Structure formats: C-alpha cells, structure tokens
C-alpha cells in the first residue's frame, strides 16, 4: 500500500507556551504539484509525534470540519480516492492540530486538509 504519515513537531513566563515548531510535514508533498493523492487501492493513515511529548504536554488531531478523525481513515471506509495536503482544499474539510501546554490551555498549530472523491471506490488500511 501507501503510507500517509503526518509528522507533528514542536520545541517548547509560560516558557513552553508558543512552541515554534513548524516541521509539520507530509510524505513527498510537493505543494505546487498538488495534494498527495492516493493512487494505490490501499493506504495506511499514520500519525507521528516528533514533538517531545513531555509529561506536561500532549497533542491531538480531532477535526470538526471533517467526518472522520485521523486514524478512523485506517478503518475500512467508503472512499473513491483521497488526497492529503497541508494547504486548503476547496470543497473539502480541515483538521486542527491543537497543542496543550497542559489540560489548562490549548492552541492550534497547523491544519490537515484532505480531498475526497465519490462513493466507495477505494478503502483504507489499518495495518
């Protein structure tokens, strides 16, 4: 199949607040070429925590604009095709990548945008 890896990375009065971590990257995502599209019949959604998961900190990928949290795509779901991008995909949806200094304070860093095609032509893979 094809791996779809989403790397999240950041380096932390509130010292760890506002971590200037920008290495949010996608697998061979030539943005000018366009969103990274699924051309194989199978693909594996993968979330990578490059950011130092200090006990004080954590992260999330929960998306309100999308029907499915990242990692329910791995489950067999009705897609015909699907492209992933970190630039806004018109007529699609978006995933906020919040970051918690602690449970007390949150803030988003990046947004994961995903294309979408009709029906159930291609299914995901949770291998």
């Amino acid at each position, epitope marked *: 199949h094809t791996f779809i890896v989403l790397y999240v990375d950041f380096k932390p009065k509130c010292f760890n607040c506002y971590p200037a971590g920008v290495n949010i990257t996608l697998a061979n995502f030539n943005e000018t*070429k366009g*969103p990274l599209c699924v051309d194989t019949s199978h693909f594996t959604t993968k979330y990578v925590a490059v950011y130092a998961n200090v006990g004080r900190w954590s992260a999330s990928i929960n998306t309100g604009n999308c029907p499915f949290s990242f990692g329910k795509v791995n489950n067999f779901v009705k897609f*015909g095709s699907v492209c992933f991008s970190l630039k806004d995909i018109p007529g699609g949806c978006a995933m906020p990548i919040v970051a918690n200094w602690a449970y007390s304070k949150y803030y988003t860093i990046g947004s994961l945008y995903v294309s979408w095609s009709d029906g159930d032509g291609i299914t995901g893979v949770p291998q």
Partner: antibody
Amino acid sequence: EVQLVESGGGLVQPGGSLRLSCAASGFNISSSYIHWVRQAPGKGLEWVASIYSSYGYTYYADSVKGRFTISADTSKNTAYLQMNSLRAEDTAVYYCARWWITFGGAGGGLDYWGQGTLVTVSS
Amino acid sequence: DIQMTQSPSSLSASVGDRVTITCRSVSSAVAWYQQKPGKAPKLLIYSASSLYSGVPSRFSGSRSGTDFTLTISSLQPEDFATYYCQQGYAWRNTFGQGTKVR
C-alpha cells in the same frame, strides 16, 4: 447567461508573447477552478494549466511550466493566460474551462467549456 | 505522477453496435467527454460513476481494478464524436490518445 468566453488569440512570431482572456458570466470564477486545454490541429486534447482564482492556486503542466503563466481578476470575473517564448509545438486552439468540485475535494470534473480560440506560431 | 493509455484510437462501427472505449496506479477520479471536430467538447461522465443531468443514458462508465471503461448501449447517428478519457483531480488534467467514432 452562463458563458465562458475565450479571446485574445491570433498569429504570433517565434518566441513571441500573447495573452488569452477567459471571461465568464452566469457564475463567479473564484467559486470554481478554471483550466486551460490546448488542442493541436489534427491532434487530441493536451493538458495545460489550471487555477483556483479565489485562493490563487496556480497549477501547471509538464511542458508549459516555465513559459506560460496563469492569473485571474475576480473583480473582472476573468481568467488570463500569458504565453511567452512560443514554438510550433504550442500553436493550437486553446479552450478555457470550468472545473466544479464534488461535495468532497476531488472535484466532479471539468464542467463547462468555451468555443476556444486558435493561436498560430508562425513567421 | 501517473499516465493514461487509451485504445483503440479509431473505432468505426455501425448503428446499434456497442462501442467499448477503455483506458488504463489509478482511483475513482476519471471522466469521459465527446467532441465534434473543431467544436467544443461536453462533459459526459465524471468520476466513472454517474452522468451529467441531461446526458443520454446510453453512455455508461465504470471501472474494474486499473481499467476504466465507457460503453454506449445503442449507438445513435448523433453519437459521432472523438471520445476522450481524462484522469486526475481539480488541479491535474491528463488525457489519452483519443478514440474516434453505414
């Protein structure tokens, strides 16, 4: 009322410069994608560049990438293609076209076509 | 970055015959157009799923594995056109050899 209108073609010297204007009515161009497609005389459809005018996304082709330039004026509701350094591989009839999006991000396809206008690279 | 292959590029059959135009790393994002010579094309099929409202029902397109296929049930005289299969998304456009169609 819904129309795509290609204009601004003609005859050009080798390595010259032209500007195609794709006006539109019945729909706002920013709410859709606008592509260009060139058909050479006695040939098939050759893929050219596209633009999402609202966000300004400019995608191109593998042949005309450092030679053609896509743009649009949404206040004018008109897309544009500036063509520079032309050769007889480019002489063809060019069509601007409207691509609409599915309820997801793939798009449905290229909805709407115009009648196009032909450019001729000749001395 | 994938390429598309279309064949045959000249298919001249008679009335009632079933023209079986076919093209072929892919997914559910292809389209089928017709075109009269020196005329504007028309959107016939998209995403190899359904028609465009108003398109005749004789045109039907679907895929199996890596093979997309348009078929016309009962050919009509006005169905004379050069049919083109397109692949890609709202940003990428790519075509094939074209198929020319007593």
